[PDB]
Amino acid sequence: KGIKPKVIEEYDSWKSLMSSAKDTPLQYDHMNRESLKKYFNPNAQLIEDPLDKPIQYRVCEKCGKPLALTAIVDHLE
Amino acid sequence: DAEIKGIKPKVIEEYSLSQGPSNDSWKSLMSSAKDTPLQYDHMNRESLKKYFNPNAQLIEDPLDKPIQYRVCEKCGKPLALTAIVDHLEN
Amino acid sequence: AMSICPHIQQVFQNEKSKDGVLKTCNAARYILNHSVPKEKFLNTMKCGTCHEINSGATFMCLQCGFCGCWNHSHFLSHSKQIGHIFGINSNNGLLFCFKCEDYIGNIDLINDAILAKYWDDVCTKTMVPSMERRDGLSGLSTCFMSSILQCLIHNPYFIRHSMSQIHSNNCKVRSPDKCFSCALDKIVHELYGALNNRQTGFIYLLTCAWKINQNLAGYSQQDAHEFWQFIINQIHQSYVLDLPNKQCECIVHTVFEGSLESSIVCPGCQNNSKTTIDPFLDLSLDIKDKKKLYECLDSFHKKEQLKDFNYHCGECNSTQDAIKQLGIHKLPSVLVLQLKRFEHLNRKLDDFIEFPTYLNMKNYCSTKVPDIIYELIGIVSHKGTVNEGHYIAFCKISGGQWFKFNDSMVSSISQEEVLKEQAYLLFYTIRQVN
Amino acid sequence: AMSICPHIQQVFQNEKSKDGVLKTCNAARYILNHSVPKEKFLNTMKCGTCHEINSGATFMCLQCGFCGCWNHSHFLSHSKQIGHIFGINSNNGLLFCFKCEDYIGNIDLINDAILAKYWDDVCTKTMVPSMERRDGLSGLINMGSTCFMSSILQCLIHNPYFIRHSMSQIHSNNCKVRSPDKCFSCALDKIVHELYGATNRQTGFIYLLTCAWKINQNLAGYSQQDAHEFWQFIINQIHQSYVLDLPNAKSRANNKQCECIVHTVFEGSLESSIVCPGCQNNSKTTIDPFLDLSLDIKDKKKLYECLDSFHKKEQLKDFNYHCECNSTQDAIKQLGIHKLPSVLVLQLKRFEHLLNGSNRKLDDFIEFPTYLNMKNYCSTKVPDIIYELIGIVSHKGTVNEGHYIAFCKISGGQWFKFNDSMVSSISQEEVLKEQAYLLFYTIRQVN
Amino acid sequence: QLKSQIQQYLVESGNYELISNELKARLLQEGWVDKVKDLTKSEMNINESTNFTQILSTVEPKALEMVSDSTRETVLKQIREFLEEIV
Amino acid sequence: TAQLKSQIQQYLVESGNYELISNELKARLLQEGWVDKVKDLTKSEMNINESTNFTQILSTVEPKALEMVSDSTRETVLKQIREFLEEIVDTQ
Amino acid sequence: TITIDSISNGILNNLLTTLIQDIVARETTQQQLLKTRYPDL
Amino acid sequence: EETITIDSISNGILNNLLTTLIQDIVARETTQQQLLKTRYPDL
Ligand SMILES: [Zn+2]
Ligand SMILES: [Zn+2]
Ligand SMILES: [Zn+2]
Ligand SMILES: [Zn+2]
Ligand SMILES: [Zn+2]
Ligand SMILES: [Zn+2]
Ligand SMILES: [Zn+2]
Ligand SMILES: [Zn+2]
Ligand SMILES: [Zn+2]
Ligand SMILES: [Zn+2]
Ligand SMILES: [Zn+2]
Ligand SMILES: [Zn+2]
Ligand SMILES: [Zn+2]
Ligand SMILES: [Zn+2]
């Protein structure tokens, strides 16, 4: 009931996106990329919703240090 | 109180109170001094052995006068006089 | 006890099935994190049956490429039609079981899926954070150390010691960062000589204190007394540390050590029939129901008749019920005295105890003893209270002039007024022995 | 001025004479310390002339072995008969001049006569004590309140970016130093370790405390406890310590681009524009980095008010000033933001430091929001850029005598209040009533 | 007859993002997100449970009630102004 | 006939009694507070007379110093000295 | 009758429902893992 | 000349002892103070 005909100028598996993803860099759900590069430093650290849920860590039994998930492997050996 | 005729005769002889030259008087102690341990004016040597420790450090009239020291021109340390000559020999 | 989704547990019995699901969960989550806004809307947030965008959550099947909406019950149907009961929400990366009708929230293994192929070591060697530290919640005067340092610094035996550079000459460490007695020497350098009065030696001294012991208390307990014991013990330690390998030739053991003697004695022939000597660095005396210092020392030197010690005296061939007496075998050169005003770790005796500028000690030594007189040369007192504790120090210097040390305000003060203070520690230097 | 014995000075003009005098002084004095009472009395305290013991002070003649009493002037007579004007007092070794009728008290060589043999060397290489140090008198600056430090670190270790850098072991791995004793960052890690992982959980702080007072001599801390100054200090340590563990001697760091925790998450950029109202030209555009912003609060009730004031077109006065056309009309200046930090740290300026020791607290409460939006302060429609408040430090008291408290929003949305060693919970309604000194804002949404 | 065609053509025009973020920004700053988060915490207690399906249908209506008129209207208006464009 | 004051002093020394007399005297005066009061007075006089000259300063200090000694110390030490003089000196 | 009104409404509900369901997802899951892991909070 | 009593010789020995002690103390104060004034003209 409204004028759509010219607009169409421009005209399934979720697993399909896997290569396109590896082409792509880290995304944020509500930190727009354009705005990041314009208004923030290019190498600025970012965590989205950093108080969203408890700090995700574990602790070493053999030293007691608190360990960020991505850090636990390098620590042990 | 009572007037005095003189010293008892037996005392006079016992202590030879009738009798040094002596313009040599004080300089004549230098020998006994050299084989005599350090002596304090009012710290009776014998009481000190008895009531204090044989190794005891002692300073007579510690607050009599101000600390005798001098300061090093290079390092700025305050040195007791007895320590200056070693400090200065590096 | 609270349990996990039974459905996901069953599939996990198969260690090879598990691997597949964790791999798929990691894959989604990666795709989710690395997809441009437009892409993401049209590929993860577009239901395969209704074709709507963001018809509520949109779950990505954990088994085919189907995406199903929540709002129109469309993943539910997928799960009912062909038996796919697991699906991942594309907003968060969360995994939902449709037979349970709840998210699989509580399995460390799924939550931490990027450590999938190291999980065994990760459960072996690292633990889940304790309930207590899980959010890092924890909070974090020195006048009781300065007060004592001021007395040490105005003590002719120690001043002499330090200015004599004896420690400097032997300390192997040679540095106030590491060495405590080196700290002391720096205080004496800043105060009496040339910088090249400051707090460097003090700061350094404090910082050695906190590291050294243990840490403990170590800002505590606000007990000038135990700090004095601490300082002097350190001093002796560093003397031992300096050697090339039960008494001692150090600054501390030749000026502050004396001995108590604890005899058992025969009433009849007045002979020690048993004698135990025990060194001391200070004397600790009670001031309860007492008015002056001598009365404290009197009570310390008292004789007790023991009801438990019936014995044969050899020297006078008789049975006795012996009499015990504490008394001083050897006096130190500086006699340090604490009045016990403190119940041990919030109560405090506040009685004024009268103490002399000259203290005779003949009446407290064994074996009659001549005059033995000390000159008062240092007081520490404590205003305020436990908790509210401020220690102040007072010291006499060459010339007879007294000075008061109130947390870095230093001011001259009369003898008459020091003698009014509520003494806690008293410092006495040997002056005359007849 | 005080005088010297001219008589003694006369004899010290000849160096052999000088040395006999000191030799005897040392000898007299040595005897006084090394003679038994009966010997001292009979042989140093007995007058040669009247044979009385202790007829006042007995002097030991310096040029012979005679002993002269005072109360009958028997030494004064010796000195007149035979010419020997000097004498030493057998009770104290003090040298007296019977022509000056005083003691020689103020010649250092005589007072320090045991050093006669090295004297030239001694007065050359050492000096008498300074008037002000001679008695060792001086205060000890006691370390009462460190609550301006505790407070800052509760922000730092509740800061999701720093926790992440610490628990990532990124520093620990690379620290050459590797000791809590010497390295500042190791201290912070230990604080993280004690707090979050597993005697008192005070040790890291103590290590942190101590490095502070050494590397900053003598203060920080105990002259001025600006919680804000301590912020600047810490984040700067972290940057120095990062730059120590580089491979090269390379000036990309410190700027134009560091890559350390501080510079990647705390640093932004201001853009100062110097513009004409005549011609539109921009003569200068400096862009200076910042690690925090300081805001003026006088006569303001709201945080955004304080920001607006910071953003307003400043009027500038340079008298002999050069502009194209309108060299006349004063130059309009504006600060605005050119780059935002991942964490915006803000200081409300409450401690006015005035002339001489004078100062003033500004206690007036400023209204600050749970979410702050910074589109308005950025440089030249700009999208909503929303930060989330996660930490506050407020200060009760006076500029010299006053106390800091920390508040942090921990993961979940629940606020806690840190007073030295007393952690407690608190309602957000109630934390928004606080007198904000240091606000800490984490980037949350950007459109 | 489909309505997902409108939607597909909004994502493509990049106006879906504008809307989606403008919406979040307003809710966020209204304190909506937070009040919701609390509402959920609350019902998990007053129903002693943590089942997503259950908590959701006591929360979701009230959640929607909580969105203020100001934001409804402004976003709705932005959608219309984008509908004209498209159809 | 007669300088017995000195001879009497020789005996007191050799017998060890001068030491006892002299040491008792200081014990007392020290404890009594006298030696310190004499120090203050000497300083006071150096001040009042703007001088550090011994002969002149002793000249005003000594006689006050002497008065200050307590009737107690003065009495007790004389008794001691008399008790000693009687073992050796015959009377009238 | 797919008017602009009912459509606009559709779309807004979708965004709003998706978001209520995201937050609720995020928070239930959170409190579950908590109660399991620490049965004594 | 005049009467030498037990009291008079005794007072002689006391005065001797007392005048020595005073002259010791005054000597120690006068010198110590001379030194400080020569060493530090400002005070
Ligand atoms: Zn470990
Ligand atoms: Zn030197
Ligand atoms: Zn299930
Ligand atoms: Zn659907
Ligand atoms: Zn499927
Ligand atoms: Zn050392
Ligand atoms: Zn020792
Ligand atoms: Zn017996
Ligand atoms: Zn001569
Ligand atoms: Zn004579
Ligand atoms: Zn002369
Ligand atoms: Zn380190
Ligand atoms: Zn950096
Ligand atoms: Zn112009």
Swiss-Prot record, chain D:
Subcellular location: Nucleus
Residues reported to bind Zn(2+) 1: 5, 7, 97, 100
Claim: Cell inner membrane is one of the keywords in the record: no
Full protein name: Ubiquitin carboxyl-terminal hydrolase 8
Domain USP: 138-444
Catalytic site positions: 147 (nucleophile), 403 (proton acceptor)
Binding positions (Zn(2+) 4): 171, 175, 183, 186
Chain positions recorded as Zn(2+) 6 binding sites: 276, 279, 323, 325
Binding site for Zn(2+) 2: 47, 50, 69, 74
Annotated InterPro entries: Papain-like_cys_pep_sf, Peptidase_C19_UCH, Ub_carboxyl-term_hydrolase, USP_CS, USP_dom, Znf_RING/FYVE/PHD, Znf_UBP
Functional description taken from the UniProt entry: Histone deubiquitinating enzyme component of the transcription coactivator SAGA complex. SAGA acts as a general cofactor required for essentially all RNA polymerase II transcription. At the promoters, SAGA is required for transcription pre-initiation complex (PIC) recruitment.
One Pfam family recorded for the sequence: zf-UBP
Amino acids binding Zn(2+) 3: 61, 64, 78, 84
An annotated Gene Ontology molecular function: zinc ion binding
One GO biological process term: RNA splicing
Domain writeup: The UBP-type zinc finger domain is required for the interaction with the SAGA complex. The USP domain is the catalytic domain, but it is only active when in complex with the other DUB module subunits.
Record text on subunit structure and interactions: Component of the 1.8 MDa SAGA (Spt-Ada-Gcn5 acetyltransferase) complex, which is composed of 19 subunits TRA1, SPT7, TAF5, NGG1/ADA3, SGF73, SPT20/ADA5, SPT8, TAF12, TAF6, HFI1/ADA1, UBP8, GCN5, ADA2, SPT3, SGF29, TAF10, TAF9, SGF11 and SUS1.
Enzyme Commission code(s) on record: 3.4.19.12
Binding site for Zn(2+) 5: 239, 258, 260, 263
Keywords: Hydrolase, Metal-binding, Nucleus, Protease, Thiol protease, Transcription, Transcription regulation, Ubl conjugation pathway, Zinc, Zinc-finger
One Gene Ontology cellular component: SAGA complex
Swiss-Prot record, chain E:
Function: Involved in mRNA export coupled transcription activation by association with both the TREX-2 and the SAGA complexes. SAGA acts as a general cofactor required for essentially all RNA polymerase II transcription. At the promoters, SAGA is required for transcription pre-initiation complex (PIC) recruitment.
Keyword Cytoplasm: yes
Taxon lineage: Eukaryota, Fungi, Dikarya, Ascomycota, Saccharomycotina
Cellular component terms (Gene Ontology): DUBm complex; nuclear pore; nucleoplasm; nucleus; P-body; SAGA complex; SLIK (SAGA-like) complex; transcription export complex 2
Induction: The gene for SUS1 bears 2 introns, and its expression is highly regulated by splicing, translation and decay. The presence of the introns thereby play a key role for SUS1 function in yeast.
Top-level taxon of the source organism: Eukaryota
InterPro entries cross-referenced by the UniProt entry: TF_ENY2 (IPR018783), TF_EnY2_sf (IPR038212)
Cellular compartment(s): Nucleus, Nucleoplasm; Cytoplasm, P-body
Gene Ontology biological process terms in this record: chromatin organization; mRNA export from nucleus; nuclear mRNA surveillance; poly(A)+ mRNA export from nucleus; positive regulation of transcription by RNA polymerase II; post-transcriptional tethering of RNA polymerase II gene DNA at nuclear periphery; protein transport; regulation of protein localization
Record-listed cross-link Glycyl lysine isopeptide (Lys-Gly) (interchain with G-Cter in ubiquitin), residues: 62
Family statement: Belongs to the ENY2 family.
Pfam families membership: EnY2
One Gene Ontology MF term: chromatin binding
Name of this protein: SAGA complex subunit SUS1
Predominant cellular place of this UniProt entry's protein: nucleus
Gene behind the chain: SUS1
HAMAP family: ENY2_Sus1
Swiss-Prot record, chain F:
Cross-link annotation Glycyl lysine isopeptide (Lys-Gly) (interchain with G-Cter in ubiquitin), location: 64
GO aspect biological process, one term: mRNA export from nucleus
Pfam families reported in the protein's UniProt record: EnY2
An example Gene Ontology CC term for this record: nucleoplasm
GO molecular function per UniProt: chromatin binding; enzyme activator activity; transcription coactivator activity
InterPro entries the UniProt entry points to: TF_ENY2 (IPR018783), TF_EnY2_sf (IPR038212)
Keyword Heme annotated: no
Superkingdom as given in the UniProt entry: Eukaryota
Induction: The gene for SUS1 bears 2 introns, and its expression is highly regulated by splicing, translation and decay. The presence of the introns thereby play a key role for SUS1 function in yeast.
Classification via Gene3D superfamilies: 1.10.246.140
Main location: nucleus
Entry's localization field: Nucleus, Nucleoplasm; Cytoplasm, P-body
Annotated keywords: Activator, Chromatin regulator, Cytoplasm, Isopeptide bond, mRNA transport, Nucleus, Protein transport, Transcription, Transcription regulation, Translocation, Transport, Ubl conjugation
Family as reported in the entry's similarity comment: Belongs to the ENY2 family.
Subunit structure, interactors included: Component of the 1.8 MDa SAGA (Spt-Ada-Gcn5 acetyltransferase) complex, which is composed of 19 subunits TRA1, SPT7, TAF5, NGG1/ADA3, SGF73, SPT20/ADA5, SPT8, TAF12, TAF6, HFI1/ADA1, UBP8, GCN5, ADA2, SPT3, SGF29, TAF10, TAF9, SGF11 and SUS1.
Protein role: Involved in mRNA export coupled transcription activation by association with both the TREX-2 and the SAGA complexes. SAGA acts as a general cofactor required for essentially all RNA polymerase II transcription. At the promoters, SAGA is required for transcription pre-initiation complex (PIC) recruitment.
Protein name, per record: SAGA complex subunit SUS1
UniProtKB/Swiss-Prot annotation, chain H:
Subcellular location: Nucleus
Additional observations: Present with 672 molecules/cell in log phase SD medium.
Entry domain remark: The long N-terminal helix forms part of the 'assembly lobe' of the SAGA deubiquitination module. The C-terminal SGF11-type zinc-finger domain together with the C-terminal catalytic domain of UBP8 forms the 'catalytic lobe' of the SAGA deubiquitination module.
Family from the record: Belongs to the SGF11 family.
Subunit structure, interactors included: Component of the 1.8 MDa SAGA (Spt-Ada-Gcn5 acetyltransferase) complex, which is composed of 19 subunits TRA1, SPT7, TAF5, NGG1/ADA3, SGF73, SPT20/ADA5, SPT8, TAF12, TAF6, HFI1/ADA1, UBP8, GCN5, ADA2, SPT3, SGF29, TAF10, TAF9, SGF11 and SUS1.
Summary of the function given for this chain in its UniProt record: Component of the transcription coactivator SAGA complex. SAGA acts as a general cofactor required for essentially all RNA polymerase II transcription. At the promoters, SAGA is required for transcription pre-initiation complex (PIC) recruitment. It influences RNA polymerase II transcriptional activity through different activities such as TBP interaction (via core/TAF module) and promoter selectivity, interaction with transcription activators (via Tra1/SPT module), and chromatin modification through histone acetylation (via HAT module) and deubiquitination (via DUB module).
Protein name per Swiss-Prot or TrEMBL: SAGA complex subunit SGF11
Full-protein positions shown: 3 to 45 of 99
